[PDB]
Design a protein around this ligand. Structure first.
Ligand SMILES: [Mg+2]
Lengths: 205, 213
């Protein structure tokens, strides 16, 4: 079984490819007595997340797939760059590349993703549209461990579907909850650690 | 064409049951004072605690047994006639151990309600609680939905989430869900009676209040 010990005060690396809205919430939370700090942000392209990091005086590293001869070579480089910061936890919810086997060898159990549905319902890139089309009244957000997207679930929180929602309005309501849930899960993992038996992840004492 | 079920308050409710009648008890407890429906009859297909509970509350009980008819279709005609005889506005069949047939649904689709101890479409079937626990979800819940020709597939009327706590076993989680499930059904019956519902595609939308007010 997977055992990840507590790491508070924890070092967090955020991997990002996009607008950095989640990074904003992490940076805002990760101050004072919050049990982690964002020590670095890694990106694979120019993006607003890199700008948000730099504005917060957080080091930014860039590892572009295009700068390496193969995905295996890129995997080694991003693993080395991330490991260089000695992270206890990695958030890759906003990262738009698949993390490879070298990265997972080092960071499985410590790498977190989010999804805008209550997994296992509505998996994939269109989970919000799919939930809306199905006519559910409750959807939600999931934080789960990254693996080789059905990794062990760390945390979930429900979100209502309101009569007359479109994809954009529902997705935005879910994203609001996703940010809070991720911030809470990072803190819990830092302070409590996690153990995984079967596919069930349990926060420690 | 959207299916439109108009308001029916003060509504007549028929409950179809085969078991211990826990949901029936919740409905009988709720259907007092200003509650916008009353249980007018309970239909069963066998001797069961639900039938005893109804009688104890002075509610008529009707019995339509599979064995008393020459075919499933004959039984379907009989239970449809028996249910319709009570002029119900709504039918609850969550505790009923028979698939309702096409004759019944021809009359009562849109007015017949079931419940499920998961947030459909997750964890369908008779092991929804055990399966949610084994999968390691942190949020499950209860669903009220319209009965149709499938199982666990009809338009969703209401849902409410229920947390999964560290150390839960199937029975502890199921207790937590069942409490929410019965309440959700009682609330959905009241909303349907007062406001009606419209179904477009597979999306069911309750009617809205006409004043704040
Ligand atoms: Mg059911």
């Amino acid at each position: 079984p997977l055992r990840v010990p507590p790491s508070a005060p924890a070092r967090l690396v955020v991997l990002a490819s996009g607008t950095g809205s989640l990074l904003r919430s992490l940076l805002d939370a990760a101050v004072g007595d919050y049990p982690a700090r964002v020590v670095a942000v890694g990106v694979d392209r120019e993006c607003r997340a890199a700008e948000i990091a730099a504005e917060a005086s957080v080091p930014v590293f860039t590892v572009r797939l295009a700068d390496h001869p193969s995905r295996d070579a890129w995997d080694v480089a991003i693993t080395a760059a991330t490991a260089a910061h000695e992270p206890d936890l990695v958030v890759s919810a906003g990262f738009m590349r698949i993390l490879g086997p070298q990265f997972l060898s080092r960071f499985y159990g410590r790498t977190l993703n989010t999804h805008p549905a209550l997994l296992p319902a509505f998996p994939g890139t269109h989970g919000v549209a799919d939930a809306l089309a199905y006519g559910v009244k409750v959807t939600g957000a999931t934080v789960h461990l990254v693996d080789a997207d059905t990794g062990p679930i760390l945390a979930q929180q429900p979100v209502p579907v309101l009569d007359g929602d479109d994809e954009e309005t529902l997705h935005e309501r879910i994203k609001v909850t996703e940010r809070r849930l991720l911030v809470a899960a990072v803190a819990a993992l830092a302070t409590h650690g996690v153990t995984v038996v079967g596919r069930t992840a349990t926060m420690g004492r």
